Amino acid sequence: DTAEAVPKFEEMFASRFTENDKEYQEYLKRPPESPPIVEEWN
Amino acid sequence: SRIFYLRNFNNWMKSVLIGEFLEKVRQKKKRDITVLDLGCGKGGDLLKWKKGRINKLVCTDIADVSVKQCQQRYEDMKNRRDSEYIFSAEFITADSSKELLIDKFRDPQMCFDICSCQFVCHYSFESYEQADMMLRNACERLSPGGYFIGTTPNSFELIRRLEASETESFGNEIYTVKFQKKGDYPLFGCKYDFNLEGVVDVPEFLVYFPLLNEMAKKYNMKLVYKKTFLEFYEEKIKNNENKMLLKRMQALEPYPANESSKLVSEKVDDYEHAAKYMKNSQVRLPLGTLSKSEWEATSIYLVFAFEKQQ
Ligand SMILES: Nc1ncnc2c1ncn2[C@@H]1O[C@H](CSCC[C@H](N)C(=O)O)[C@@H](O)[C@H]1O
């Protein structure tokens, strides 16, 4: 149950939010978000 | 009121998200749609499902006062005798992270076409067993082809701001997030405080989406898509029905303001992006936008959808 899954996940995602976290590093390259703008709002 | 448009926008997000997967389900099923509203709150989505013409809805939440209040709204909606059809409904007080919903349903053989979990999932990641239990209650009784859709904070954005902050806090006049510690982020029980001036002040847990993705596989779920709130918006506003809805729901604030009205924010540069925008060759006015303060608070969220395999 828990005894197997948790340590399994601990290994699978040890790079979590580190320099080896490719998804997160890619996310950090994203420009700061500007709020939605819509023309002709009336 | 300061948060007036923040609310409407978030409600629009749910409307369009719900809308998209109601259309997909109906494309496959062609019959009575059954839906589980997990962590239903006081029934902020009752109207959305009414507009969607589903046949049965199951509303469940940990807060008993909320659930009954949700029930009360629904009774008021059905008891307003008009011509509109309304789903049959069922209301269950329950901790969906420690209790099995299937044992609580009126019908032991109950199945759903859609589980809608809006702003709830991250409370379950207090521990693995709770996260697994909520995922199980959300996905196990999904009809094949059904969906698990919802909204939850983007841990990527949360950690990004946390580590960029001088302290363990970050936010503005509208929201506040407080971690106990940076650099250490457990897969479960990563606790932070969340305060949104007008909606919440309630401890939450970090949700590492690759983890949620993995855990969901346990119940034969494949990822349909995961999007930041900006990305989802950028796609959905490409459809004029969604855009007209955005206006009707007043999900953006008109800019610039009337001489006689007021912008919602008094903050000095909260609308610089809008001002800069109309400094290019002429814009058709007025603009619809959101205060920078409000966007900071809501851009933290992502949308996700999983599909139950065949
Ligand atoms: N473990 C749990 N089981 C069921 N509901 C939970 C829960 N943890 C938190 N909740 C509920 O999640 C909700 C967060 S507020 C969002 C309300 C609703 N989803 C809407 O969008 O309108 C609260 O109502 C809270 O009671």
Tell me the radius of gyration of chain A.
Answer: 19 Å
- CATH class descriptor of chain B: Alpha Beta
* Main sheet summary of chain B: 7 strands, mixed
Oligomer: heterodimer
| Category by helix and strand content of chain A | mainly alpha
Largest sheet: spatial strand order of chain B: 3-2-1-4-5-14-11
PDB class: translation
Keywords: mRNA capping, mRNA processing, translation
Assembly: dimeric
Entry title: Crystal structure of mRNA cap guanine-N7 methyltransferase in complex with RAM
Q: What's a quick, concise take on this entry?
A:
The complex is a heterodimer of chains A (42) and B (310). Chain A is mainly alpha-helical and 42 residues long.
What features would you describe in this structure?
- The complex is a heterodimer of chains A (42) and B (310).
- With 42 residues, chain A is mainly α.
- Chain A has one domain.
- Helices cover 43% and strands 5% of the residues of chain A.
- The radius of gyration of chain A is 19 Å and the shape is elongated.
- Chain B has 10 helices and 14 strands.
- A 7-stranded mixed beta sheet of chain B has the order 3-2-1-4-5-14-11. In chain B, strands 6, 7, 8, 9 and 10 form a 5-stranded antiparallel beta sheet that branches.
- The chains are: A mainly alpha (42), B alpha/beta (310).
- The structure holds S-adenosyl-L-homocysteine.
- S-adenosyl-L-homocysteine binds next to loops of chain B.
- S-adenosyl-L-homocysteine is lined by residues 39-41, 44-45, 61-63, 66, 95-97, 118-120, 123-124 of chain B.
- It is classed as translation.
- Keywords: mRNA capping, mRNA processing, translation.
- The assembly is dimeric.
- Crystal structure of mRNA cap guanine-N7 methyltransferase in complex with RAM.
